Design a protein around this ligand. Structure first.
Ligand code: PV6
Ligand code: PV6
Length: 134
């Protein structure tokens, strides 16, 4: 419903900040942290009706989620967590909460200028991933 018009398309990762400390906070093990930290994924976003699809294409992994805003779904993350995810819109920001093993992390996706900025927070620790159009 014109839901994500400014986000639809293909985006390539151009910069990352604080990746390692965020992944440590999440509980990701050494080898996965090191290998995952090299990746420069593309993020492919599309919308069909009420269904939003976000794919990540990478040398580390490929992942895909499809969802309806507000409606919880199962997600196996790139680091192999089995989480319950709920994604909503808050003032133009896509807010994605992942719950697993009594833990929680929040991933926010927004547009700033010609960038797509992703901010992920686990307790006090934030990582920022900046994407540009591919
Ligand atoms: S609708 C959408 C889809 C993907 C990333 C971000 C957003 C958003 N902030 O509206
Ligand atoms: S924001 C972030 C940072 C580090 C790993 C993964 C992510 C993400 N879910 O986009």
């Amino acid at each position: 419903s014109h839901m994500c018009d400014a986000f639809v398309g293909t985006w390539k990762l151009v910069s990352s900040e604080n990746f390692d400390d965020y992944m440590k906070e999440v509980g990701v093990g050494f080898a996965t942290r090191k290998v995952a930290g090299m990746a420069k994924p593309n993020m492919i976003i599309s919308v069909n009706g009420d269904v939003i699809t976000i794919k990540s294409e990478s040398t580390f992994k490929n992942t895909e989620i499809s969802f309806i805003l507000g409606q919880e779904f199962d997600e196996v993350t790139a680091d192999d967590r089995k989480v319950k995810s709920t994604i909503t819109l808050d003032g133009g920001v896509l807010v994605h909460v992942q719950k697993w093993d009594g833990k929680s992390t929040t991933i926010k996706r927004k547009r700033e200028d010609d960038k797509l900025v992703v901010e992920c927070v686990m307790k006090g620790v934030t990582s920022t991933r900046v994407y540009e159009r591919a």
